[PDB]
């Protein structure tokens, strides 16, 4: 199987899977069954902003998210991303529904990789304002789309903008990431994306993930709902 | 054949394909045949600069090139890059050597595109100070390799680091950048390299491109020598 | 008296100090009396966007104008700023109303300068998307205010956010900025502001301007309205 | 007195003030005594890079020291320094010598600080590859010198290249740096700095420190030697 570190906006409880009983973001290694989380005040059809960071001096990863007017959420987890994450990856974005559903409406996607040798800095870095109908350097798998509105819909819309269920859809940035070289003293991430989850019902589903993966990753079968177009099982 | 707009540093005068009588750096458009040169006091065995710009405003395709206390030479000329190129593009570098020979060693390479709305950025950046033997975002053609000393040898070098005749190779970077938008009001981009041209002979040849091309570029057949890589004539 | 160079964003056409008889953008050297204009379709109550870019190769200054939903308007000058400005400057925005009046509210501003020399990069970066009541990198001269509603207001608001007549107001970046070194092959400069013009009359008055001076530059005396804050009289 | 937040490499050891037996990288707050130590193996005349992180979600502050051809040296100790420094402070690099001397060169010095908001960045960034004679954008103090050679001298130095003791000397950043803002969701810095620390004797002292100051920040008194510029005794 592939190997996935995520950060996870979880818009619905599973709690059999270990979900607290209310949305929330959390931190994803190798399982879709968060090593933390955090409560997350979900605002149904609000723009919503999530930062990730990560470096290997500390070796933490950490996430924000926030609307405007309101508070944030936060949670961190310690993990050496060079013990879980091969040399080279690919970044992307992730999304389902299941029989509950939401729109999974990506507005904006930053991303920046830094590796200082003690020679010193290779750097990558993309910004999306906007999603052109043939995005040449998104991977899309699954039922992302690109281009309505200018903007990235991870899973099924239909043409009035209404979200459909049991979708899953990605988004992976073309070029390999070199997230670790045998010469670097220090190696750093971080990720923002701006996106735009919103449903006709009290109860959303199933949320947005921005992953990082072996750069051949592909949708696992049956990874709608829960899973988050990330994870083949529940383990 | 492939579209290419390049700029060229030419280490060897073939005066009947129009180059002057001295080693110069040049703007070729879809010709080996510079539409403007300057001359360029291009020195054995030192480490060089170049820095190319360009604006959709301007539309002026400009690029100096220097060395550590020399003074700089320089050439702009005057083209609208978007009746020239496609959309998409790939960015690369190209280097050649005929019956006279030189190293063509790339040390560094960094490129900046940003497209700007009226919404407003798209950007792609990337930094690449040291490669190495298996550099994934790299498309890698003809003879040439990386992780040499941490370097990019565009044309072939024996163990010895003496460089070979005859040799011809290139480097795209692996992600299609988007140099054309229709809701853009400025795109602009900057590529820099720095090089090292070493050659026994007091006649090197043949020189160093940064270049423009449709994405699925490759080496013309034939292009050793006065083409560079680039072209499969002297038309 | 002080030295300056400016894009203006003309709202008022003075059609005696050579204006032409529509809003309108320009570049002004030395002079209110613009060296070159281009029509501006200056909408009342829009959020607008402002871009300058210049570099030392091409020696031309460029703008660019536009709202969401609306074509851009663009104008260009060739100067070659080292023959006009000194060394060291100061970089600032600058706005004014007369009889006729307008808001002159900036909601965010990035400048970017950039030295390369033959050794290579010295950078100034700066970017606001927020202003605070004692905002200390920033010199407020005249009427200017920062921190309401999180914005810079060039010119005096009412505490109903009405725009007062007779006034005039700018903000300076703290810091000079070096734009000529002895040793730079390539010294480039661009500037980004997003505006809010509004005013309760068919003919707003009198514009805003992004302007470069001397470090030391200060309002001149009797350069509300048509002297946009940057000149002492209409030669 | 001054607030001081610092790293300092620590060329010289000072046991009755907690330094260990040998050179040492140090976080220093509020005091010369470190809150933590790493061993540092400094090589007398060899150019050396430092490289200086924090956010204010991780509230974790690291450094990492190295030189071409060698390991790293690596520290890191848990502040949040909201609690510690104001909301607006400036940024320098310190240095001394006593009876015990060396050069204190700086070859490079860049800055980044970034301010994220619920609305999104604030951001100022400055690099220095170049010193000139009359750098406006710096505030000198005590021996402080640039310029000669295009570098940064920390500390007193003959014509003859030969270092000084009994010197003191730091360069801040001309603009205020905003740390804190009450609306931001992660705040981030990051520091690099290229130094030559070079010395006839085999007993070098004192050693260089990035440092962050209240914004009126001075030499104290008496801070030659083992206080590094930095503080006004040794508690
Ligand atoms: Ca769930
Ligand atoms: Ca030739
Ligand atoms: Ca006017
Ligand atoms: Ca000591
Ligand atoms: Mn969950
Ligand atoms: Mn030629
Ligand atoms: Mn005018
Ligand atoms: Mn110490």
């Given amino acids: 199987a592939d190997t996935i570190v995520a950060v996870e906006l979880d818009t619905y409880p599973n709690t059999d899977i270990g979900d607290p009983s209310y949305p929330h973001i959390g931190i994803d290694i190798k399982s879709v069954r968060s090593k933390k989380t955090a409560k997350w005040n979900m605002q149904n059809g609000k723009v919503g902003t999530a930062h990730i960071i990560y470096n290997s001096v500390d070796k933490r990863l950490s996430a924000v998210v926030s609307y405007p007017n309101a508070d944030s959420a936060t949670v961190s987890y ?22 509950y559903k939401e729109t ?21 870095h993309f910004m999306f304002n906007q999603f052109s109908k043939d995005q040449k ?51 750093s991430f971080e990720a923002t994306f ?9 109860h959303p589903a199933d949320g947005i993930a921005f992953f990082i993966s072996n750069i051949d990753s592909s949708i696992p ?9 990330l994870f083949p099982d529940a383990n």
Wanted: proline share 4%; hydrophobic share 35%; aromatic share 6%.
């Fill in 78 to 99: 310690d993990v050496d991303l060079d013990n879980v994450l091969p040399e080279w990856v690919r970044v992307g974005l992730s999304a389902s529904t299941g029989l």
């Fill in 104 to 124: 999974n409406t990506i507005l904006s996607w930053s991303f920046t990789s830094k590796l200082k040798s003690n020679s010193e800095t290779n750097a990558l």
């Fill in 137 to 187: 350097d998104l991977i899309l798998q699954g039922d992302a789309t690109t281009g309505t509105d200018g903007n990235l819909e991870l899973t099924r819309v239909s043409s009035n903008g209404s979200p459909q269920g049991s979708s899953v859809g990605r988004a992976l940035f073309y070029a390999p990431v070199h997230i670790w070289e045998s010469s670097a003293v220090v190696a």
């Fill in 194 to 202: 701006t996106f735009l989850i919103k449903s006709p019902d009290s």
């Fill in 221 to 229: 079968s049956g990874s709608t709902g829960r899973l988050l177009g």
